[PDB]
Every structure is written in C-alpha cells, then in structure tokens.
C-alpha cells in the first residue's frame, strides 16, 4: 500500500491546543543544559551517550529514555551496555555519566513516551535538545512497523512543541534516497517535494528507508508550522572501530560479510566488475567509523541549541575518491595473516561461497551473509552529495585532527578490528 507525505500532518498526531500554543512559543534557549536521547542502548546510541556527555558542562544533564519495566531496570540495561569486556569503555562511561546521567523507563511510541505525567512535564519544561537515535542502524532484518514508528516521532515532536521549542536531532539514513533520482537527492531538498510517496507491505511494516522518511516528513511539518529547529543526519554504513573493543553492529552487512569471509576462508579476486583487460577497478566503499558519526551528530546537532535557526539535513557519509573499497578490505585481512584466500572467477567463488556457508555451524550460518540470499559482480561516495556535512565537519572542527578536520578514510585497523571483535564474541 501507498503512504503519502501529505498525510503525515501534525494535526493527525498532536492536539490542536499544543499546535496553536507552539506558533507563539519562545524560540529555543541558546543554552545546552539538558539533553533527551532515545536509543541509547543501540550501536550508534551508546556512542552518542559518550559524545553528548562530553559536550555537556558540569551543570549538564543527559536523560536517556530506555525500554524497561522500571527506571532501575532501564538504568541497569544501559549500565550493561558499557560493561562489555572493555574496562576503558566502562571507565569513560562512569566518569562522563557521574551525576549527569538520568535513565528513565519508557517507550517512544507509547503516548507520553510511556512516562508519568510529572516526568513528562519536567522533560517538556527542561529539555534543551532532543536526539532521536535509530535503535537499529543498517540492520538486514529491518522490519519496522510504520504505525509505532511514526507515532514515536510524533510523540517526540510533541514534547519538542509543548512548553518551549526544542531543537530536534534526527538520525536518518542514506536509504531514504533509494528510489529517488540521484540529482534530486540532496541535503538542501525538502523531503516532501522529492519523495511525496512511499509503500509498505501488507502488515503495515516498512523498510529502513521508509521508516526514516516518515520521520523526516513529520519534522519538516514541525518546521513549517512552528519553526522547530531541526537537524537531520542521513547516515550511510556505520563501521565498528578501535576506540573500544567488543562493540559490534552484528546485523549489518559488513559485520556479516567479515564473519562470512573469515569462517569460509574464501574471497573473490574482485567484488566489482573487472575492466576490459580483466583487471581490478578503482572502487570506494561508503563507511564511517561510529566514533566519528556519533561525534559529528553530537557536535552538529548540539550547536543548533548556539541558536541556529532553520531546517538542516546532513549526508553523514564517506565521499572520498580514495580507491578504498571492498577489495582493499579483503587485502587488509589477507595481509594481517588471516586464513582467507581468493578465487579468480567471481562466478566460481560465489557457488563455493554459498555452498561453504551452508556447511557452517548453526549459529555462524545464522549470523552470516547466507540468509541475505535472493547476485553478480558490483559496479565501480560520488552518488549522493556531501557538501553541507563536509563543510559543517570542517567548520565545527569535528574529529581528533583539529588543524585539518575532514571526513576520515577507512583504514586497515578498523577492518581487522571486526575479526578481533567477532572472536571475543565467540562467533569465530
């Protein structure tokens, strides 16, 4: 069935009194004291916990909405996130969280975020910035129910419109642009103009692209109606990195592939079409380390709450023409001494690869790329533009290198860290 942008109007989710008051609500406080974060337990979210606490002053407070039976159960579920076989991760967390961290039980999709009236009112009064982080990022079994998704974003927008206007940071995805003409899929575009309609299946469930799309559309509406300051971050593939050990996005294509290449021992000569002379063509994989992405999001979203007016979208992606793609990742694994070899003919590799995945133990096979079965050599970022995000990264000096700040390149230790992590997790 078809869902239209024109149908995702705020009046269908938020009461008129709230919407009317919001037009005359005082514009945001330029002071960043209290931040509300959703999805703190997620892969990206846990990194945003760390980065948002770093941005906050000694008088600052981060409030994490977490799914649980009680606040004790929520605070513990999040404590366990940073107690994952790395003592340095736990030490940074505890230090940064000390007296500045509040964790509350609740569901984004439930009315009032599943919170008591006094808590909800307190949040509406005090919150200076809302950060809406996708609990699942880049997952293969991505199957989100559209109803609860959309209702959730509307509930966050509602708290952003209630007592004072709140800057809203929304984690989105590059997949929003899957069905859109490449020239039209830009950072400046109104998502409602360039993508007026989508589809869901018969069970009202949507793919990653459609899920985030609806959120962007609703935020555009909040911007039109009420001048809500909004920052949308469309992320590409987000990579585990070496900041901490043991932090893996198990369900994404990359983690599954590294697992599949390792456990099978076999890679192809090239993942991409060879040239006329049969040789390996320059390629680029669009991946960013999670540390960078969390930092970028925390820094660029937090500065709206300075007091930057307007609707902003950023393409959080790796746009370098650096010749660093899937074949290089394989090169790095081989060079590190891992038991992986390559078959010349892509076609043979693929027949053997599929067969060999079928021979693996139950758990491995399940967390591999084998379920994703449905092709052929790839083709080669430079697809989607990154002008706004790149300028913002350089302007805000996002990253370690404060002299030449830029979007990083993927290097070998990041890839090797995938196998290291998979071993600690028992999967290899």
Q: What angle do CA 102, 223, 100 make, to 5 degrees?
A: 15
**CB of 154 within 8 A of CB of 203?**
no
CA gap 341, 257 in Å, rounded: 15
Technique behind the model: X-ray
Cα(147)–Cα(299) distance, rounded to whole angstroms?
A: 31
Burial readout 115-136 (b: 16 or more C-beta within 10 A, e: otherwise): beeebbeebbebbbbbbbbbbb
Decide if 352 contacts 343 (C-beta within 8 A).
yes
**Pairing state between β 168-173 and 129-132:** parallel
CATH class of 1-428: alpha beta
* Token couple for 154: 């509307």
Q: Which two tokens stand for residue 9?
A: 């109007």
Q: How far is CA 90 from CA 56, 80, 83, 426, in A?
A: 19, 9, 6, 21
- CA 359 from chain centre, in angstroms, equals 33
Task: In whole angstroms, give the CA distance from residue 422 to residue 258.
Answer: 9
- Given resolution (angstroms): 2.3
Rounded to whole angstroms, the Cα distance separating 47 from 240 reads 11
- Per residue, the 3-state secondary structure of the chain, as one string, reads CEEEHHHCCHHHCCCHHHHHHHHCCCCCCCCCCEEEEECCCCHHHHHHHHHHHHHCCCCCEEEEEECCCCHHHHHHHHHHHHCCCCHHHHHHHHHHHCCCEEEEECCCCCHHHHCCHHHHHHHHHHCCEEEECCCCCCECCCCEEHHHHHHHHHHHHHHHCCCCCCCEEEEEEHHHHCCCCCCCCCCCCCHHHHCCEEECCCCCEECHHHHHHHHHHHHHHHHHHHCCCEEEEEECEEECCCCCCCCCCCCEHHHHHHHHHHHHCEEECCCECCCCCCCCCCCCCCEEEHHHHHHHHHHHHHCCCCCCCCEEEEEECCCCCCCCCHHHHHHHHHHCCCCCEEECCHHHHHHHHHHHHCCCCHHHHHCCCCCCCCCCCECCCCCCCCHHHHHHHHHCCCCCCCCCCCCCCCCHHHHHHHHHHHHHCCCC
Q: CB–CB of 254/327 below 8 Å?
A: no
Q: Name, in order, each residue with C-beta under 8 angstroms of 355's C-beta and a sequence gap of 6 or more.
A: none
Give the Cα separation of 90 and 382 in Å (integer).
38
Phi, psi of 318 (to 5 degrees): -95, 110
Rounded CA-CA distance 117/115 in Å is 6
């Amino acid at each position: 069935t078809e869902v239209h942008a024109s149908d995702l109007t705020l009046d269908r989710f938020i009461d008129a009194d709230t919407l009317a008051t919001a037009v005359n609500l005082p514009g945001p406080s330029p002071e960043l004291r209290t931040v509300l974060l959703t999805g703190a337990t997620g892969f990206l979210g846990r990194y945003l916990v760390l980065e948002l606490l770093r941005r906050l002053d000694v008088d600052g407070r981060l409030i994490c909405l977490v799914r649980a039976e009680s606040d004790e159960d929520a605070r513990r579920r999040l404590e366990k996130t940073f107690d994952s076989g790395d003592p340095e991760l736990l030490r940074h967390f505890k230090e940064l969280a000390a007296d500045r961290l509040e964790v509350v039980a609740g569901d984004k999709s439930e009315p009032d975020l599943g919170l008591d009236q006094p808590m909800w009112r307190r949040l509406a009064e005090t919150v200076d910035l809302i950060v809406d982080s996708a609990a699942m990022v880049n997952a293969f079994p991505y199957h989100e129910l559209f109803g609860p998704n959309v209702a959730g974003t509307a509930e966050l927008i509602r708290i952003a419109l209630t007592t004072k206007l709140k800057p809203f940071t929304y984690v989105s995805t590059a997949d929003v642009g899957a069905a859109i003409e490449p020239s039209a899929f830009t950072e400046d575009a109104d998502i409602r103009v360039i993508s007026p309609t989508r589809t869901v299946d018969g069970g009202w469930a949507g793919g990653y692209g459609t899920s985030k799309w609806a959120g962007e559309v609703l935020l555009r509406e909040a911007n039109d109606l009420c001048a809500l300051p909004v920052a949308v971050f469309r992320c590409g593939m987000i990579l585990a990195d070496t900041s901490y050990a043991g932090q893996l996005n198990m369900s994404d294509w990359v983690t599954r592939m590294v697992l599949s290449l390792m456990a099978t021992g076999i890679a192809p000569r090239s993942f991409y079409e060879p040239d006329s002379e049969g040789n390996r063509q320059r390629a680029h994989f669009d991946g960013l380390p999670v540390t960078f992405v969390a930092e970028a999001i925390a820094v660029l979203g937090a500065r709206v709450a300075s007091s930057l007016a307007g609707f902003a979208t950023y393409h959080v992606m790796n746009p370098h023409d650096d010749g660093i793609g899937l074949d290089e990742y394989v090169d790095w694994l081989i060079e590190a001494g891992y038991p992986i070899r390559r078959i010349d003919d892509f076609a043979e590799w693929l027949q053997r690869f599929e067969a060999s995945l079928g021979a693996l133990p139950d758990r491995q096979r399940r967390h591999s790329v084998l379920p994703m079965l449905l092709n052929s050599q790839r083709l080669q970022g430079c697809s989607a533009p990154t002008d706004r995000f790149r300028a913002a990264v350089r302007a805000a000096k996002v990253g370690s290198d404060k002299d030449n700040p830029d979007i990083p390149h993927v290097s070998a230790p990041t890839i090797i860290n995938y196998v290291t992590n998979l071993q600690l997790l028992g999967l290899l």
